[PDB]
Amino acid sequence: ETLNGGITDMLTELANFEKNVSQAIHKYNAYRKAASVIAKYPHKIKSGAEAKKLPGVGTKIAEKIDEFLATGKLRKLEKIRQDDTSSSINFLTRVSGIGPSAARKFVDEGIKTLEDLRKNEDKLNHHQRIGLKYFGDFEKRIPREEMLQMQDIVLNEVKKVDSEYIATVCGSFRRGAESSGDMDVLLTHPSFTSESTKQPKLLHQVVEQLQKVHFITDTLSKGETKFMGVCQLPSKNDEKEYPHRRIDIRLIPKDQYYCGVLYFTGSDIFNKNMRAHALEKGFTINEYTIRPLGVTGVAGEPLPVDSEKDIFDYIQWKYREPKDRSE
DNA sequence: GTCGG
DNA sequence: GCTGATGCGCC
DNA sequence: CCGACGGCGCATCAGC
Numbered sequence: 575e576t577l578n579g580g581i582t583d584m585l586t587e588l589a590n591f592e593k594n595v596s597q598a599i600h601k602y603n604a605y606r607k608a609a610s611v612i613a614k615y616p617h618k619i620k621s622g623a624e625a626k627k628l629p630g631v632g633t634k635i636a637e638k639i640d641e642f643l644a645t646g647k648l649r650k651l652e653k654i655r656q657d658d659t660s661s662s663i664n665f666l667t668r669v670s671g672i673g674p675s676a677a678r679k680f681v682d683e684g685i686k687t688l689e690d691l692r693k694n695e696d697k698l699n700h701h702q703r704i705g706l707k708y709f710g711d712f713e714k715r716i717p718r719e720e721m722l723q724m725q726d727i728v729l730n731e732v733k734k735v736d737s738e739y740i741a742t743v744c745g746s747f748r749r750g751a752e753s754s755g756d757m758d759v760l761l762t763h764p765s766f767t768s769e770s771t772k773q774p775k776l777l778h779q780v781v782e783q784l785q786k787v788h789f790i791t792d793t794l795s796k797g798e799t800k801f802m803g804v805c806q807l808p809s810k811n812d813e814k815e816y817p818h819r820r821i822d823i824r825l826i827p828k829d830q831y832y833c834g835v836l837y838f839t840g841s842d843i844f845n846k847n848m849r850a851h852a853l854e855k856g857f858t859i860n861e862y863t864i865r866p867l868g869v870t871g872v873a874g875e876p877l878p879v880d881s882e883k884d885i886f887d888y889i890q891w892k893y894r895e896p897k898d899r900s901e
Numbered sequence: 902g903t904c905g906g
Numbered sequence: 907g908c909t910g911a912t913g914c915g916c917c
Numbered sequence: 918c919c920g921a922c923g924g925c926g927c928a929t930c931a932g933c
């Protein structure tokens with residue numbers, strides 16, 4: 575039981591319908607902003623009107639909140655749940671590497687279930703095949719206890735490649751979450767800055783060492799600065815194995831560490847809303863820089879940054895600890 | 902879907 | 907190959 | 918067919 579749990583689950587469910595079925599990404603974003611502001615609200619919502627006062631709730635969402643508050647359900651969602659087609663499209667998007675577009679296509683050709691995907695593996699790309707192979711594993715959360723073991727493995731192996739590397743586990747882990755959806759690792763090295771890429775293969779050396787020791791087991795995508803893949807803790811004899819887990823590693827210029835760690839710590843909705851506040855203050859924020867906004871459209875050169883807090887400072891936000899950036 | 906130019 | 911658009915994903 | 922909305926890495930396709 576969470577305070578306005580009913581409402582936020584309804585809106586979250588509709589968000590996912592819009593993104594996955596209607597391919598209406600802004601409606602997705604609207605529903606999520608509403609869910610977010612309502613989850614922050616410290617009172618029980620008693621009407622649509624009350625909700626309408628909040629930023630990002632308008633007429634239509636207020637009417638839905640009135641309906642749900644009177645009846646305990648939403649007709650629109652009942653119909654969507656009874657629609658086999660919608661339900662298949664939505665389910666398939668949960669496979670890593672099947673987005674809304676591929677899900678729709680698969681369903682159009684009558685591929686609607688996990689069994690159907692295994693029968694039509696030849697229709698899937700490498701990434702999708704891996705998402706399917708570990709589907710059950712990727713559904714499951716990682717207890718913090720395991721995240722700590724995984725961190726120890728990563729930091730130790732990284733140190734063995736070169737002790738000038740610094741690896742920081744971000745995402746929900748950094749936000750103090752008791753369980754995590756995956757492992758996000760921010761990487762820096764003194765040879766890679768906004769000025770110069772001096773050393774080649776900097777990210778590659780880490781990935782290959784983590785592969786050598788059989789921690790990283792599969793690669794979904796890979797470039798010079800981002801690794802997206804799979805890893806697994808070692809297990810003991812006749813102990814059942816650990817689930818395979820999703821891992822993301824991001825290599826950021828050392829001199830842009832605070833912008834990177836801010837981005838990688840999230841949450842996602844926090845980030846979008848911090849970046850949104852930046853815009854209405856005449857700045858733009860990415861994982862590399864905070865820049866002031868001109869007029870021609872263009873951003874100006876990066877502003878100096880010496881902490882996560884300095885970024886909040888530019889935009890008139892009081893600092894938020896990582897744990898206070900979750901939903 | 903909402904908000905604001 | 908390029909530029910630009912799309913589809914996958916990340917926080 | 919009021920348009921903006923947060924921003925970008927990697928992979929792949931279109932029209933050169």
Ligand SMILES: Nc1ccn([C@H]2C[C@H](O)[C@@H](COP(=O)(O)OP(=O)(O)OP(=O)(O)O)O2)c(=O)n1
Pocket residue numbers: 689690693
């Ligand atoms: N668990 C199973 C069952 C059957 N098959 C085989 C038999 C067929 O050669 C092919 C599937 O053909 P179907 O058209 O029966 O499979 P569909 O998934 O299309 O049938 P449905 O309409 O029931 O979804 O795969 C399989 O690989 N695995």
Ligand SMILES: [Cl-]
Pocket residue numbers: 597598599600601602
């Ligand atoms: Cl939309």
Ligand SMILES: [Cl-]
Pocket residue numbers: 829830831832833834862879880
């Ligand atoms: Cl920085």
Ligand SMILES: [Mg+2]
Pocket residue numbers: 745746755756757758
């Ligand atoms: Mg994560």
Ligand SMILES: [Mg+2]
Pocket residue numbers: 755842
């Ligand atoms: Mg996430």
Ligand code: NA
Pocket residue numbers: 625626627628629630631632
């Ligand atoms: Na409102």
Ligand code: NA
Pocket residue numbers: 666667668669670671672673
């Ligand atoms: Na997916």
Ligand code: NA
Pocket residue numbers: 745756757758821822916
């Ligand atoms: Na991740």
